[PDB]
């Protein structure tokens, strides 16, 4: 609107600045303000350049004065409101740690619906992850997700308004796979682990557990991890 | 507990406004100068 | 920018056609297309004396403009009840379409006692007001309205009225000013 | 030309000029190159704004490959450890290269 | 003095409707109430007082 207001503004400007100066028999010119002309002098002023000729009775002059600060207003709030706009976005910070998702909330965030993630947020003396869980716990519409497909689709639907917290296995595998959308950020909230189980009192334990130990030492648990996660 | 934009055309409507006017009066001054420069020239003949 | 009588017929047609446009967008309440009640909130047309539905349960069925509505106003200052005042009585379209009438007639008895130039002038001076209170007319109506929205085509209806009513002002100008030069070049031989 | 290189350099630095375009042809573009210039400079100038506004310090190292392709920053382990072991016997593409 | 000379009545008959029109008179309205009541309220949706 703005915009269209400026063009009328424009044509109204220079048709009242011919009109008042070159309407007068008397004066007839001494002025070569024509109609071409004075369009040409307002496009000039507005652009904040050199016009050639400039208005020299009280009305053409009166005319330029109101329409030069006219113009000065526009500009000055033109570059004004882009530098405001440019800052803003400049300001824009994306969030990497959990407590700056808590402190903010303007994107949505929340765990499945079920698991051990509402065990960890409930059972938590973290200041940050109980203000979290009770963030979840008061929140509409429901930030909770029934399955873990619905909550990738979800966030990746939402585009950038919703986040999702989960093993970060699943999350850089994810990561890892087409279309590459969704990325994991930031550090793991609490620590876990997978292990190889077997029955109580077995004879299998001991050396399984020397095993899983040497694979690791050896490196080759890693080269397995590297091998399914990122090589395919 | 559970608890920029462009600008708009109300924002610079006073510049235009006095634009608007500034436009307006000139136009009164050119039509009073033709006028009195009218009535001046009857005078005279 | 050629001859006499085509130009009279060209600014003729155009003085009409401005004013047809403009009595055109002030009695067309087609100027806003936005979500709002007209009796839930839907998306209805709005112009400058009733807001009318669209798409609605109750199509057609439609109110006038709460102008100064009830139920904690909440006042405002003296400039903003000016601002109010002027956009609910649309003083400025009104005056616009009356000097678009009286450049219309000054320009039609401009035939009747040719000698007279100044009335051409006169009607030039009264498109070119008009054109101007238009201009008023349509920053106060944005103003008012912005207090996910469209323009309809009565609004710039009223866009092309005021280019229309400044391009005839200015012929009328230039016809004025061929008329002093020609009044001009026959006195010096 | 002279003369019109004179004129865009002017009104692009928006220094006025001692002439101007009078043809219709020649005021076009004197007014798209006016407001061709008018929009970069405003756009100059806000941009150094919020440059000058707000700081953003990076770091150059995001990650250990980073630290594997550069060689500015030097970076080394424990004469002797756990680091120094694992980085010993890995056969890995990245760490082989720090090794 | 201006509480008991002052019209239309601001005196209300609940905190509830006393909230209520706080929050539906725009600014133009203000409730004297327990410091308590008042921080709860104000930790409740929507956020508007």
């Not at chain 3, 087609?30 to 009640?37: A, I």
């Not at chain 3, 609910?88 to 039609?108: D, K, R």
């Amino acid at each position: 609107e703005i915009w269209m207001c400026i063009v009328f503004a424009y044509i109204g400007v220079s048709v009242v600045l011919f009109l008042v100066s070159r309407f007068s028999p008397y004066e007839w010119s001494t002025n070569e303000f024509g109609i071409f002309n004075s369009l040409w002098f307002s496009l000039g002023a507005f652009m904040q350049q050199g016009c050639d000729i400039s208005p020299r009775s009280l009305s053409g002059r009166i005319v330029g004065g109101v329409w030069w600060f006219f113009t000065l207003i526009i500009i000055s709030s033109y570059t004004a409101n882009l530098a405001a706009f440019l800052t803003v976005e400049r300001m824009v910070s994306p969030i990497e740690s959990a407590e700056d998702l808590s402190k903010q909330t303007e994107i949505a965030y929340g765990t499945l619906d079920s698991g051990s993630t509402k065990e960890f947020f409930r059972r938590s003396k973290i200041a940050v992850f109980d203000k979290m869980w009770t963030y979840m716990r008061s929140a509409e519409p429901s930030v909770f997700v029934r399955t873990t497909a619905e909550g990738v689709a979800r966030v990746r639907k939402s585009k950038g308004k919703y986040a999702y917290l989960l093993e970060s296995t699943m999350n850089e595998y994810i990561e890892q796979r087409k279309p590459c959308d969704t990325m994991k950020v930031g550090g793991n909230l609490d620590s876990k682990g997978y292990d190889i189980a077997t029955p109580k009192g077995s004879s299998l334990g001991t050396p399984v557990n020397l095993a899983v130990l040497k694979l690791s030492e050896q490196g080759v648990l890693d080269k397995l991890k590297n091998k399914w996660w990122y090589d395919k | 507990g559970e608890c920029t934009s462009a600008l708009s055309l109300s924002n610079v409507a006073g510049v235009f406004y006095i634009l608007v006017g500034g436009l307006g009066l000139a136009m009164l001054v050119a039509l009073i100068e033709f006028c009195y420069k009218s009535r001046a020239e009857a005078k005279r003949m | 920018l050629f001859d006499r009588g085509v130009q009279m017929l060209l600014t003729t047609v155009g003085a009409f056609a401005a004013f047809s446009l403009m009595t055109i967008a002030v009695g067309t309440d087609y100027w806003l297309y936005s979500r709002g009640v007209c009796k839930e909130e839907v998306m209805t047309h709005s112009g400058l004396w009733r807001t009318c539905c669209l798409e609605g349960n109750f199509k057609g069925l439609c109110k006038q403009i709460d102008h100064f509505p009830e139920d904690a106003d909440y006042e405002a200052d003296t400039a903003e009840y000016f601002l109010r005042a002027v956009r609910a009585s649309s003083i400025f379209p009104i005056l616009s379409v009356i000097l678009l009438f009286m450049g219309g007639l000054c320009i039609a008895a401009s035939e009747f006692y040719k000698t007279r130039h100044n009335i051409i002038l006169s009607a030039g001076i009264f498109f070119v007001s008009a054109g101007l209170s238009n201009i008023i007319g349509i920053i106060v109506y944005i103003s008012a309205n912005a207090g996910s929205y469209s323009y309809g085509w009565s609004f710039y209806f009223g866009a092309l009225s005021f280019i229309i009513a400044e391009m005839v002002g200015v012929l009328a100008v230039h016809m004025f000013i061929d008329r002093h030069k020609q009044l001009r070049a026959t006195a010096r031989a």
